[PDB]
Amino acid sequence: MWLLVRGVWETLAMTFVSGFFGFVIGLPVGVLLYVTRPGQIIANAKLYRTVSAIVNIFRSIPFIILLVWMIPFTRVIVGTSIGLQAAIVPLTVGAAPFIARMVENALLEIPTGLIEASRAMGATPMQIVRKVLLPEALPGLVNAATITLITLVGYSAMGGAVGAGGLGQIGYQYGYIGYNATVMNTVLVLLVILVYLIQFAGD
């Protein structure tokens, strides 16, 4: 009843994390596609050896461990170091590498300049070409962002720590200390279907 709700609400704020980053830091670095090799369009060089490396090194780091390291950092940037407002910041970054590369596979998977044969039509890059890349690009994209969501929510569960807030601390607190075969379970059952819902939510 009352114990469950503040928390799930907050767990959903994991999604609010994405509206915030899937946009600004994911796709914008999905600009790796210009830099993948042939300069698909003027915007490449040797940057990719390292830009792809940073993403990979960020990918290398584990969830809470990045979060704590970030806590000092969380403070310096609009942070009290604790709570949801602060917590999402380390989640979008933990998230940046998972999301960015997801974009790269989506962009690479689509059929080569075969579409840039659009330019041959008289396509003009801008929204015209970029905007009509998306079309083919969304079925790939929707699946990509939706999966990050199941992983972002799992990331709050990893939360429940000092640089965190939400449902994970509720599961953490009663769960770590004060085990309830009752409440601890609600948390389990709650999260598992919430996870499945995220996956069905897509399509």
Binding site: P111, L114, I115, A117, S118, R119, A120, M121, G122, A123, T124, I128, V132, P135, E136
Partner: protein, 343 residues
Amino acid sequence: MIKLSNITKVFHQGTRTIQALNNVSLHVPAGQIYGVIGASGAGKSTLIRCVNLLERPTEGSVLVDGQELTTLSESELTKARRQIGMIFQHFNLLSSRTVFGNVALPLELDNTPKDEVKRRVTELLSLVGLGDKHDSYPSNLSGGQKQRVAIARALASNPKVLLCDEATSALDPATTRSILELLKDINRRLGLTILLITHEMDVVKRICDCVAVISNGELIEQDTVSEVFSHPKTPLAQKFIQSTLHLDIPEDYQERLQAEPFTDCVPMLRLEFTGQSVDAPLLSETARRFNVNNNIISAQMDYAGGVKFGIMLTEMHGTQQDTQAAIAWLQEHHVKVEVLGYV
């Protein structure tokens, strides 16, 4: 209508500079289907591009219908690209949209009109034929079909030049004939000018009016299909009849043939008759004339360009002088003949 002149383009690897096209001059009238044919990867592979200026040809002036394109004005080039259309090497359809949509895209683009887009797409679908029946079903179509949508989109613009690039390459002969004809019709009546590029001269016999043979960024021969008789690429000038080659399919017969010339055996000759005429009963004549016997292993004729292409693989039995008399006689009588080897 489409002039390529003094056109040269090369690519830079930093480590090396790689030659592609070296001084090409193309004279393709209007209302004519012009074929360029080349060896694998001879650069035909690049060139259809210079014409709509996808590639940015290092030198020469490319003039399509009166404006000479140069990489310097994207907005201006865009007014022109609408003018010159192009099918593709592969299909190029958005799996996202339906046939109407793919075809629509260009209409949708620069023009932006409410009604016009639907009627054009509809008539065009009707002209390609995938339309009265295929408005709605999207990108999952037969290859000839996919293709149709494609040309249909190329026409969608309402252009003066269509660029054809290996269109029939991924398409089986049955499809390829239905498709090549489809170009032919829009050619006779839409008044459309086509500049073609291909692997196989099968494509060149059906639709080509003028041809260019390209090896190494240079054009070896350029003329109407009918007069093409003149230099080295007799192969593909001989883009045969499978019927000619098949002789040697039973490779037991090919391994029979010894290249080395030796006594007490006879030669296999490839005879190509340059346009003498149908009125050319030369082998029979030699038969009466020099006492030679012609066992013909293979042979074919076709009228490409309204005249008979003709080639032949035979054994010519006789005394040594007599065969010599015969090939000699034939050469006098305009037959390129080369000795394959001796059986």
